[PDB]
Structure formats: C-alpha cells, structure tokens
C-alpha cells in the first residue's frame, strides 16, 4: 500500500516513550502525522517537506517527529500522557495526490 504505519494498535503506560513509524512507497515529498478527535476531524501534529526537516502542525505540543529518509516519518511521544490516547494517521502527499495510512489506535493508561 501507499502508506503503512506501525504499530496498528498500542497500549502504553503513562511516561513510556512511544514512537509511531510510517513508511511510504510512492516517495512523495510531504509526510504528515494527524490525530483524529473521533466523531470529528484530523488535526495536524507535525509534517515534513523532505528528509531532515519537520515543521509544527496545529497541535505540536507533547510530540516530536523525525524524517530520517524520504520514505520514513516517525512521531515521537517522549513521555506518554493519557490525553495522547486517540487514533493517529500518517499521510503522504505530493504531485496532486494524498494518501493515508490505516491508523494507529493508541491508549495511554
């Protein structure tokens, strides 16, 4: 598929370091990490325009991100809190296209 994110499901304890990985196969320039309110919309955490570069979305607080290569973009919860419980979507975009991953359900208890 266009975008594969992992893990698909994760249960974490408060204060553990959680990393979500996302790999694309169409090599589009832009990658995004969204979280979904649920019953509502996707909110942008961080995005990158290319390897070595990330920029803050609408809700960056509490997340870091790394784009170590064109194909990989990872979201980093240094110290997991329960407010970070939700569904996470990776996206890749460019050349008049936008693809989504299947979602990561994260619960921080």
């Amino acid at each position: 598929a266009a975008v594969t994110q992992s893990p698909r499901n994760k249960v974490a304890v408060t204060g553990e370091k959680v990393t979500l990985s996302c790999q694309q196969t169409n090599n589009h320039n832009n990658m995004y990490w969204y979280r979904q309110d649920t019953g509502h919309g996707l909110r942008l955490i961080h995005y990158s325009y290319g390897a070595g570069s990330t920029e803050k979305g609408d809700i960056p607080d509490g997340y870091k991100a790394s784009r170590p290569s064109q194909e990989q973009f990872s979201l980093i919860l240094e110290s997991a809190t329960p407010s970070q419980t939700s569904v996470y979507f990776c996206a890749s975009g460019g050349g008049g296209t936008l693809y989504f991953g299947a979602g990561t359900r994260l619960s921080v208890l």
Partner: protein
C-alpha cells in the same frame, strides 16, 4: 580579522518560532565524509559533484557541494580531495525547478581539502581545543579531532556542535536552552572570524541558506587554530 559580535548582531532563539530540530539535524551525528575522491560532474559552474555513498542510511550516492564561485570550483575540480561537511535534502536541486525530489543525491557547501600532503604520518589525529563560554564564563572545554593539517572551519564547527548537542543540549527538537551563540575561530597569524549559531528570526528555518555560509571553503591550520564557543542563556 572580523569584528566581534555586539548582542544586536546575534540571532536570538526566543525570536525563532519554528522547529529547532531542523538546526539540530544538521549537526547531530550528521556529516558527509569521504577520503581520496575526485569530482565526477557538476550542475552549475560553482559546484562539484562527487560519488559518495551514505554509510549510515541509504539516502545518497552522489553529493553536490557548492563553492562560493566558479573559480573556487575550478581549484578543486580535477583534484584528489577529502570532503567533510553538513548536508541537506530539502531544496537540494540539480536543475532550475523548485520542488523537485532528486533521489540518491544530497547537497552541501565547501568542505573540500586537497588530499596529498594534508595527512598525518600514521593513523594520527590532531586535537583542537574548544573553550565554551556560558554568559561569559568558561564552564567547559573539550577537544575535537581531525585527520587533516589544513581542515575546513566547517568540519571543526560541526564536530564542536555535535559534541555540544550531546553534552549541553545546544539544540533540542523545539528550541534551545541558549538565547544566542557564536563560534569564533582564532588563527595563528591573529586572524579571527565567527559564525552565528542560531536561526534567523521567524517561523521557519531554511537549512540550505543557513549552511551556504560554508561555501567560502575557509580552511585553518588544525595545529595552531583556537576555537571559542560563546553562549548566553534565555
């Protein structure tokens, strides 16, 4: 020598609102290094392209380095050289069009020294002392190492920042503990020059434009050069 900075000459991290991780990236265990290579191509008249492969990941097989001008590129074009510098991908272009990905390629500025006669007798390394000043107090000193007699300021700058990211959190993903920073080099003949270590104010950091200061390919005598890193806290 270049005149020392007044506080108003220095970028302040408080005035930068983007992701400081983009600056961190350029200096945190990050560099192109090659030994005994010769350029294989070019794009524009001021740049050289080398066959250098990413040893860490597999992000590139070619590195384009831009030099200040065409005559600096001509100096190195057919020479066997070593290369050391900080590379970038965003806006790394091999034609005129903006927004083009060039797979297998990365870009950098300067970083070139003639290979022949620039190395030490054995597997020997030269230490260069770095003195770090925090709010005008020398709180920490350490050495960086190079295999070169004539080494680019860029390579020493990189090694110094890399150490400081790791020991003093010089740059972090979101911001920096420091408000201002400059790295000053003091040559044997009394010449000094310095680089601002903080991003220009605003919401975004252009990595390519920041690194372009290295395009003069400034070299120093690693045996006699002195380095001071001057930081102030928020």
């Amino acid at each position: 020598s270049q005149p020392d900075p007044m506080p108003d000459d220095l970028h302040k991290s408080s005035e930068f609102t983007g992701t400081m991780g983009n600056m961190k990236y350029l200096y945190d265990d990050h560099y192109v290094s090659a030994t005994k290579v010769k350029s294989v191509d070019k794009f524009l008249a001021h740049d050289l392209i080398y066959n250098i492969s990413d040893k860490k990941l597999k992000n590139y097989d070619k590195v384009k380095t831009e030099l200040l001008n065409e005559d600096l590129a001509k100096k190195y074009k057919d020479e066997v050289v070593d290369v050391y510098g900080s590379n970038y991908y965003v806006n790394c272009y091999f034609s005129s069009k903006d927004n083009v990905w060039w797979p297998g390629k990365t870009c950098m500025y300067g970083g070139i020294t003639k290979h022949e006669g620039n190395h030490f007798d054995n597997g020997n390394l030269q230490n260069v002392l770095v003195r770090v000043y925090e709010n005008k107090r020398n709180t920490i000193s350490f050495e960086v190492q190079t295999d070169k007699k004539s080494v680019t300021a860029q390579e020493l700058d990189i090694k110094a920042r890399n150490f400081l990211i790791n020991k003093k959190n010089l740059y972090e993903f979101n911001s920096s503990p420091y408000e201002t920073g400059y790295i000053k080099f003091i040559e044997n003949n009394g010449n000094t020059f310095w680089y601002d270590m903080m991003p220009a104010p605003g919401d975004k950091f252009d990595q390519s434009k920041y690194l372009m200061m290295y395009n003069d390919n400034k070299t120093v005598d690693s045996k006699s050069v002195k380095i001071e890193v001057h930081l102030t806290t928020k």
